[PDB]
């Protein structure tokens, strides 16, 4: 898993924030001027693997996403998560996108 | 708050799912063929109002989002949350978008 390897610094990335639980890094193919990926260090494949037993942990991840977003994007930010084929999920390790740095489009998908 | 009123059925909506904690309804200006809004019935203004004290509740909301998404969008779905001006947040009551029903675009914002 490329995201487990990035989180453990086996594959290089430009680190925005890291702690015992999460790892955040710049997206190398950005769609916004600020485009950050936030991953749990623990491998969970997608949002469809959230259970009642790990929902408190995923809430903590989302809280830490908000702390990164409000620091990096004081003018506002969008959080995106992709599940499966129609959403274009490329890596099967849950990753939140933080998008900001401009007035973001809201266009037909 | 228009979303508190929708959640309490004071303003009509097309309901997808409802329980003691959450309310989900069709977006009337959709950007995808499946476009569902999911709100907590409790008023929380945005993701920037997540705290360590409510992070477990927001994890539960995200779990219920995933249950709606995997049912309505078995081929995959995207979850979006907008915070503040640059993201275009229009209603100050936290709302998750579930987008699906086609191979979704990933375009420059
Ligand atoms: Zn992984
Ligand atoms: Zn409200």
PDB file of C-alpha atoms and ligand atoms in Angstrom:
ATOM      1  CA  UNK A   1       0.000   0.000   0.000  1.00  0.00           C
ATOM      2  CA  UNK A   2       1.493   3.255  -1.228  1.00  0.00           C
ATOM      3  CA  UNK A   3      -0.225   5.254   1.570  1.00  0.00           C
ATOM      4  CA  UNK A   4       1.046   3.008   4.382  1.00  0.00           C
ATOM      5  CA  UNK A   5       4.540   3.435   2.891  1.00  0.00           C
ATOM      6  CA  UNK A   6       4.178   7.224   2.635  1.00  0.00           C
ATOM      7  CA  UNK A   7       2.942   7.374   6.269  1.00  0.00           C
ATOM      8  CA  UNK A   8       6.030   5.470   7.414  1.00  0.00           C
ATOM      9  CA  UNK A   9       8.337   7.689   5.266  1.00  0.00           C
ATOM     10  CA  UNK A  10       9.440   4.805   3.037  1.00  0.00           C
ATOM     11  CA  UNK A  11       8.198   6.770   0.033  1.00  0.00           C
ATOM     12  CA  UNK A  12       9.098  10.506   0.122  1.00  0.00           C
ATOM     13  CA  UNK A  13       6.407  13.209   0.465  1.00  0.00           C
ATOM     14  CA  UNK A  14       6.144  16.881   1.351  1.00  0.00           C
ATOM     15  CA  UNK A  15       4.870  16.678   4.919  1.00  0.00           C
ATOM     16  CA  UNK A  16       2.339  19.219   6.171  1.00  0.00           C
ATOM     17  CA  UNK A  17       1.643  17.611   9.566  1.00  0.00           C
ATOM     18  CA  UNK A  18       2.304  14.296  11.302  1.00  0.00           C
ATOM     19  CA  UNK A  19       1.374  12.812  14.713  1.00  0.00           C
ATOM     20  CA  UNK A  20       1.042   9.352  16.356  1.00  0.00           C
ATOM     21  CA  UNK A  21      -2.271   8.741  14.508  1.00  0.00           C
ATOM     22  CA  UNK A  22      -2.279  10.722  11.222  1.00  0.00           C
ATOM     23  CA  UNK A  23      -0.028  11.852   8.387  1.00  0.00           C
ATOM     24  CA  UNK A  24      -0.712  14.798   6.042  1.00  0.00           C
ATOM     25  CA  UNK A  25       1.136  15.619   2.902  1.00  0.00           C
ATOM     26  CA  UNK A  26       0.823  17.673  -0.289  1.00  0.00           C
ATOM     27  CA  UNK A  27      -0.989  16.088  -3.229  1.00  0.00           C
ATOM     28  CA  UNK A  28       1.442  15.940  -6.158  1.00  0.00           C
ATOM     29  CA  UNK A  29      -1.344  16.345  -8.748  1.00  0.00           C
ATOM     30  CA  UNK A  30      -3.280  19.183  -7.145  1.00  0.00           C
ATOM     31  CA  UNK A  31      -6.678  20.427  -8.279  1.00  0.00           C
ATOM     32  CA  UNK A  32      -6.559  23.509  -5.995  1.00  0.00           C
ATOM     33  CA  UNK A  33      -3.733  25.816  -4.882  1.00  0.00           C
ATOM     34  CA  UNK A  34      -3.849  24.177  -1.457  1.00  0.00           C
ATOM     35  CA  UNK A  35      -4.408  20.423  -1.859  1.00  0.00           C
ATOM     36  CA  UNK A  36      -3.452  18.272   1.156  1.00  0.00           C
ATOM     37  CA  UNK A  37      -4.035  14.553   1.701  1.00  0.00           C
ATOM     38  CA  UNK A  38      -4.710  13.380   5.283  1.00  0.00           C
ATOM     39  CA  UNK A  39      -4.440   9.689   6.103  1.00  0.00           C
ATOM     40  CA  UNK A  40      -4.671   7.608   9.255  1.00  0.00           C
ATOM     41  CA  UNK A  41      -1.402   5.760   9.802  1.00  0.00           C
ATOM     42  CA  UNK A  42      -3.558   2.642  10.431  1.00  0.00           C
ATOM     43  CA  UNK A  43      -4.699   0.887   7.238  1.00  0.00           C
ATOM     44  CA  UNK A  44      -8.496   1.196   6.721  1.00  0.00           C
ATOM     45  CA  UNK A  45      -9.399   0.655   3.042  1.00  0.00           C
ATOM     46  CA  UNK A  46     -12.248   3.193   2.529  1.00  0.00           C
ATOM     47  CA  UNK A  47     -15.141   4.830   4.271  1.00  0.00           C
ATOM     48  CA  UNK A  48     -17.150   1.644   3.644  1.00  0.00           C
ATOM     49  CA  UNK A  49     -14.931   0.006   6.309  1.00  0.00           C
ATOM     50  CA  UNK A  50     -16.131   2.360   9.054  1.00  0.00           C
ATOM     51  CA  UNK A  51     -17.956   0.282  11.719  1.00  0.00           C
ATOM     52  CA  UNK A  52     -19.620   1.231  15.013  1.00  0.00           C
ATOM     53  CA  UNK A  53     -16.385   0.015  16.673  1.00  0.00           C
ATOM     54  CA  UNK A  54     -14.071   2.481  14.804  1.00  0.00           C
ATOM     55  CA  UNK A  55     -16.462   5.402  14.324  1.00  0.00           C
ATOM     56  CA  UNK A  56     -14.965   7.306  17.300  1.00  0.00           C
ATOM     57  CA  UNK A  57     -11.476   6.974  15.739  1.00  0.00           C
ATOM     58  CA  UNK A  58     -12.719   8.218  12.351  1.00  0.00           C
ATOM     59  CA  UNK A  59     -14.352  11.190  14.210  1.00  0.00           C
ATOM     60  CA  UNK A  60     -10.922  11.971  15.688  1.00  0.00           C
ATOM     61  CA  UNK A  61      -9.374  11.828  12.216  1.00  0.00           C
ATOM     62  CA  UNK A  62     -12.047  14.235  10.935  1.00  0.00           C
ATOM     63  CA  UNK A  63     -11.337  16.583  13.901  1.00  0.00           C
ATOM     64  CA  UNK A  64      -7.635  16.594  13.002  1.00  0.00           C
ATOM     65  CA  UNK A  65      -8.592  17.271   9.339  1.00  0.00           C
ATOM     66  CA  UNK A  66     -10.488  20.349  10.554  1.00  0.00           C
ATOM     67  CA  UNK A  67      -7.438  21.549  12.571  1.00  0.00           C
ATOM     68  CA  UNK A  68      -5.239  21.296   9.466  1.00  0.00           C
ATOM     69  CA  UNK A  69      -7.897  22.940   7.280  1.00  0.00           C
ATOM     70  CA  UNK A  70      -8.575  25.944   9.547  1.00  0.00           C
ATOM     71  CA  UNK A  71      -4.778  26.562   9.902  1.00  0.00           C
ATOM     72  CA  UNK A  72      -3.850  26.175   6.232  1.00  0.00           C
ATOM     73  CA  UNK A  73      -7.080  27.644   4.807  1.00  0.00           C
ATOM     74  CA  UNK A  74      -8.420  30.433   7.059  1.00  0.00           C
ATOM     75  CA  UNK A  75     -10.644  31.652   4.184  1.00  0.00           C
ATOM     76  CA  UNK A  76     -12.388  28.251   3.898  1.00  0.00           C
ATOM     77  CA  UNK A  77     -11.739  24.740   2.656  1.00  0.00           C
ATOM     78  CA  UNK A  78     -13.471  21.711   1.191  1.00  0.00           C
ATOM     79  CA  UNK A  79     -13.039  18.128   2.493  1.00  0.00           C
ATOM     80  CA  UNK A  80     -13.511  15.255   0.020  1.00  0.00           C
ATOM     81  CA  UNK A  81     -13.437  11.492   0.450  1.00  0.00           C
ATOM     82  CA  UNK A  82     -13.773   9.075  -2.512  1.00  0.00           C
ATOM     83  CA  UNK A  83     -15.265   5.588  -2.119  1.00  0.00           C
ATOM     84  CA  UNK A  84     -14.885   3.072  -4.957  1.00  0.00           C
ATOM     85  CA  UNK A  85     -14.957   3.136  -8.681  1.00  0.00           C
ATOM     86  CA  UNK A  86     -17.487   5.804  -9.555  1.00  0.00           C
ATOM     87  CA  UNK A  87     -15.718   8.252  -7.218  1.00  0.00           C
ATOM     88  CA  UNK A  88     -12.324   7.494  -8.704  1.00  0.00           C
ATOM     89  CA  UNK A  89     -10.745   6.120  -5.543  1.00  0.00           C
ATOM     90  CA  UNK A  90      -7.180   5.237  -6.676  1.00  0.00           C
ATOM     91  CA  UNK A  91      -5.566   4.155  -3.406  1.00  0.00           C
ATOM     92  CA  UNK A  92      -7.437   1.742  -1.098  1.00  0.00           C
ATOM     93  CA  UNK A  93      -6.332   3.410   2.150  1.00  0.00           C
ATOM     94  CA  UNK A  94      -8.766   6.035   3.433  1.00  0.00           C
ATOM     95  CA  UNK A  95      -7.581   9.562   2.549  1.00  0.00           C
ATOM     96  CA  UNK A  96      -9.270  12.910   3.068  1.00  0.00           C
ATOM     97  CA  UNK A  97      -8.567  15.724   0.634  1.00  0.00           C
ATOM     98  CA  UNK A  98      -8.367  19.311   1.975  1.00  0.00           C
ATOM     99  CA  UNK A  99      -8.879  21.795  -0.883  1.00  0.00           C
ATOM    100  CA  UNK A 100      -8.522  25.567  -0.595  1.00  0.00           C
ATOM    101  CA  UNK A 101      -6.579  28.701  -1.421  1.00  0.00           C
ATOM    102  CA  UNK A 102      -9.182  30.107  -3.835  1.00  0.00           C
ATOM    103  CA  UNK A 103     -12.949  30.399  -4.316  1.00  0.00           C
ATOM    104  CA  UNK A 104     -13.541  26.776  -5.343  1.00  0.00           C
ATOM    105  CA  UNK A 105     -15.733  25.765  -8.294  1.00  0.00           C
ATOM    106  CA  UNK A 106     -19.010  23.859  -7.791  1.00  0.00           C
ATOM    107  CA  UNK A 107     -19.599  22.320 -11.208  1.00  0.00           C
ATOM    108  CA  UNK A 108     -21.564  19.432 -12.674  1.00  0.00           C
ATOM    109  CA  UNK A 109     -19.740  16.154 -12.146  1.00  0.00           C
TER     110      UNK A 109
ATOM    111  CA  UNK B   1     -31.686  27.913  10.150  1.00  0.00           C
ATOM    112  CA  UNK B   2     -33.097  26.342   7.008  1.00  0.00           C
ATOM    113  CA  UNK B   3     -31.446  22.960   7.798  1.00  0.00           C
ATOM    114  CA  UNK B   4     -32.838  22.758  11.346  1.00  0.00           C
ATOM    115  CA  UNK B   5     -36.275  23.485   9.839  1.00  0.00           C
ATOM    116  CA  UNK B   6     -35.857  20.842   7.120  1.00  0.00           C
ATOM    117  CA  UNK B   7     -34.740  18.278   9.753  1.00  0.00           C
ATOM    118  CA  UNK B   8     -37.888  18.961  11.777  1.00  0.00           C
ATOM    119  CA  UNK B   9     -40.094  18.785   8.621  1.00  0.00           C
ATOM    120  CA  UNK B  10     -41.159  22.433   8.867  1.00  0.00           C
ATOM    121  CA  UNK B  11     -39.794  22.974   5.364  1.00  0.00           C
ATOM    122  CA  UNK B  12     -40.649  20.156   2.894  1.00  0.00           C
ATOM    123  CA  UNK B  13     -37.936  17.886   1.424  1.00  0.00           C
ATOM    124  CA  UNK B  14     -37.657  14.565  -0.373  1.00  0.00           C
ATOM    125  CA  UNK B  15     -36.503  12.307   2.450  1.00  0.00           C
ATOM    126  CA  UNK B  16     -33.984   9.550   1.758  1.00  0.00           C
ATOM    127  CA  UNK B  17     -33.420   8.457   5.374  1.00  0.00           C
ATOM    128  CA  UNK B  18     -34.181   9.760   8.863  1.00  0.00           C
ATOM    129  CA  UNK B  19     -33.383   8.562  12.416  1.00  0.00           C
ATOM    130  CA  UNK B  20     -33.149  10.022  15.965  1.00  0.00           C
ATOM    131  CA  UNK B  21     -29.785  11.672  15.114  1.00  0.00           C
ATOM    132  CA  UNK B  22     -29.643  12.406  11.352  1.00  0.00           C
ATOM    133  CA  UNK B  23     -31.785  13.498   8.419  1.00  0.00           C
ATOM    134  CA  UNK B  24     -30.986  12.877   4.728  1.00  0.00           C
ATOM    135  CA  UNK B  25     -32.718  14.397   1.789  1.00  0.00           C
ATOM    136  CA  UNK B  26     -32.274  15.009  -1.943  1.00  0.00           C
ATOM    137  CA  UNK B  27     -30.386  18.134  -2.999  1.00  0.00           C
ATOM    138  CA  UNK B  28     -32.721  20.239  -5.151  1.00  0.00           C
ATOM    139  CA  UNK B  29     -29.846  21.640  -7.249  1.00  0.00           C
ATOM    140  CA  UNK B  30     -27.928  18.434  -7.901  1.00  0.00           C
ATOM    141  CA  UNK B  31     -24.478  18.229  -9.463  1.00  0.00           C
ATOM    142  CA  UNK B  32     -24.634  14.413  -9.842  1.00  0.00           C
ATOM    143  CA  UNK B  33     -27.466  11.992 -10.657  1.00  0.00           C
ATOM    144  CA  UNK B  34     -27.484  10.910  -7.016  1.00  0.00           C
ATOM    145  CA  UNK B  35     -26.960  13.956  -4.778  1.00  0.00           C
ATOM    146  CA  UNK B  36     -28.042  13.542  -1.133  1.00  0.00           C
ATOM    147  CA  UNK B  37     -27.525  15.927   1.785  1.00  0.00           C
ATOM    148  CA  UNK B  38     -26.984  14.387   5.248  1.00  0.00           C
ATOM    149  CA  UNK B  39     -27.328  16.578   8.322  1.00  0.00           C
ATOM    150  CA  UNK B  40     -27.227  16.005  12.061  1.00  0.00           C
ATOM    151  CA  UNK B  41     -30.536  17.050  13.597  1.00  0.00           C
ATOM    152  CA  UNK B  42     -28.442  18.914  16.226  1.00  0.00           C
ATOM    153  CA  UNK B  43     -27.218  22.341  15.074  1.00  0.00           C
ATOM    154  CA  UNK B  44     -23.402  22.411  14.609  1.00  0.00           C
ATOM    155  CA  UNK B  45     -22.385  25.268  12.275  1.00  0.00           C
ATOM    156  CA  UNK B  46     -19.489  23.693  10.288  1.00  0.00           C
ATOM    157  CA  UNK B  47     -16.635  21.274  10.576  1.00  0.00           C
ATOM    158  CA  UNK B  48     -14.646  24.032  12.315  1.00  0.00           C
ATOM    159  CA  UNK B  49     -16.973  23.488  15.315  1.00  0.00           C
ATOM    160  CA  UNK B  50     -15.835  19.886  15.810  1.00  0.00           C
ATOM    161  CA  UNK B  51     -14.126  19.617  19.239  1.00  0.00           C
ATOM    162  CA  UNK B  52     -12.559  16.683  21.098  1.00  0.00           C
ATOM    163  CA  UNK B  53     -15.862  16.513  23.037  1.00  0.00           C
ATOM    164  CA  UNK B  54     -18.082  15.967  19.922  1.00  0.00           C
ATOM    165  CA  UNK B  55     -15.639  14.091  17.687  1.00  0.00           C
ATOM    166  CA  UNK B  56     -17.210  10.703  18.566  1.00  0.00           C
ATOM    167  CA  UNK B  57     -20.648  12.040  17.516  1.00  0.00           C
ATOM    168  CA  UNK B  58     -19.279  13.374  14.213  1.00  0.00           C
ATOM    169  CA  UNK B  59     -17.670   9.902  13.651  1.00  0.00           C
ATOM    170  CA  UNK B  60     -21.137   8.374  14.109  1.00  0.00           C
ATOM    171  CA  UNK B  61     -22.571  10.830  11.581  1.00  0.00           C
ATOM    172  CA  UNK B  62     -19.827   9.869   9.105  1.00  0.00           C
ATOM    173  CA  UNK B  63     -20.604   6.147   9.705  1.00  0.00           C
ATOM    174  CA  UNK B  64     -24.275   6.789   8.910  1.00  0.00           C
ATOM    175  CA  UNK B  65     -23.189   8.732   5.773  1.00  0.00           C
ATOM    176  CA  UNK B  66     -21.295   5.610   4.672  1.00  0.00           C
ATOM    177  CA  UNK B  67     -24.394   3.405   5.261  1.00  0.00           C
ATOM    178  CA  UNK B  68     -26.492   5.703   3.057  1.00  0.00           C
ATOM    179  CA  UNK B  69     -23.743   5.916   0.422  1.00  0.00           C
ATOM    180  CA  UNK B  70     -23.102   2.160   0.110  1.00  0.00           C
ATOM    181  CA  UNK B  71     -26.900   1.511  -0.167  1.00  0.00           C
ATOM    182  CA  UNK B  72     -27.712   4.271  -2.658  1.00  0.00           C
ATOM    183  CA  UNK B  73     -24.418   4.096  -4.592  1.00  0.00           C
ATOM    184  CA  UNK B  74     -23.118   0.500  -4.749  1.00  0.00           C
ATOM    185  CA  UNK B  75     -20.785   1.496  -7.623  1.00  0.00           C
ATOM    186  CA  UNK B  76     -19.076   4.187  -5.497  1.00  0.00           C
ATOM    187  CA  UNK B  77     -19.727   7.633  -4.085  1.00  0.00           C
ATOM    188  CA  UNK B  78     -17.987  10.840  -3.081  1.00  0.00           C
ATOM    189  CA  UNK B  79     -18.507  12.630   0.271  1.00  0.00           C
ATOM    190  CA  UNK B  80     -17.990  16.413   0.381  1.00  0.00           C
ATOM    191  CA  UNK B  81     -18.127  18.917   3.221  1.00  0.00           C
ATOM    192  CA  UNK B  82     -17.723  22.692   2.658  1.00  0.00           C
ATOM    193  CA  UNK B  83     -16.290  24.995   5.336  1.00  0.00           C
ATOM    194  CA  UNK B  84     -16.607  28.769   4.908  1.00  0.00           C
ATOM    195  CA  UNK B  85     -16.412  31.218   2.107  1.00  0.00           C
ATOM    196  CA  UNK B  86     -13.821  29.794  -0.245  1.00  0.00           C
ATOM    197  CA  UNK B  87     -15.635  26.433  -0.214  1.00  0.00           C
ATOM    198  CA  UNK B  88     -18.987  28.035  -0.919  1.00  0.00           C
ATOM    199  CA  UNK B  89     -20.687  26.954   2.293  1.00  0.00           C
ATOM    200  CA  UNK B  90     -24.223  28.415   1.928  1.00  0.00           C
ATOM    201  CA  UNK B  91     -25.958  27.045   5.024  1.00  0.00           C
ATOM    202  CA  UNK B  92     -24.196  27.263   8.413  1.00  0.00           C
ATOM    203  CA  UNK B  93     -25.386  23.862   9.666  1.00  0.00           C
ATOM    204  CA  UNK B  94     -22.963  21.023   8.937  1.00  0.00           C
ATOM    205  CA  UNK B  95     -24.073  19.016   5.877  1.00  0.00           C
ATOM    206  CA  UNK B  96     -22.359  16.163   4.072  1.00  0.00           C
ATOM    207  CA  UNK B  97     -22.945  15.716   0.359  1.00  0.00           C
ATOM    208  CA  UNK B  98     -23.144  12.159  -1.060  1.00  0.00           C
ATOM    209  CA  UNK B  99     -22.507  12.227  -4.827  1.00  0.00           C
ATOM    210  CA  UNK B 100     -22.824   9.241  -7.154  1.00  0.00           C
ATOM    211  CA  UNK B 101     -24.699   7.495  -9.933  1.00  0.00           C
ATOM    212  CA  UNK B 102     -22.000   8.037 -12.579  1.00  0.00           C
ATOM    213  CA  UNK B 103     -18.216   8.096 -13.006  1.00  0.00           C
ATOM    214  CA  UNK B 104     -17.636  11.465 -11.318  1.00  0.00           C
ATOM    215  CA  UNK B 105     -15.361  14.165 -12.755  1.00  0.00           C
ATOM    216  CA  UNK B 106     -12.127  15.200 -10.996  1.00  0.00           C
ATOM    217  CA  UNK B 107     -11.445  18.625 -12.476  1.00  0.00           C
ATOM    218  CA  UNK B 108      -9.470  21.725 -11.562  1.00  0.00           C
ATOM    219  CA  UNK B 109     -11.352  23.826  -9.032  1.00  0.00           C
TER     220      UNK B 109
HETATM  221 ZN1  LIG C   1      -2.440   1.411   3.731  1.00  0.00          ZN
HETATM  222 ZN1  LIG C   2     -29.353  24.334  12.049  1.00  0.00          ZN
END
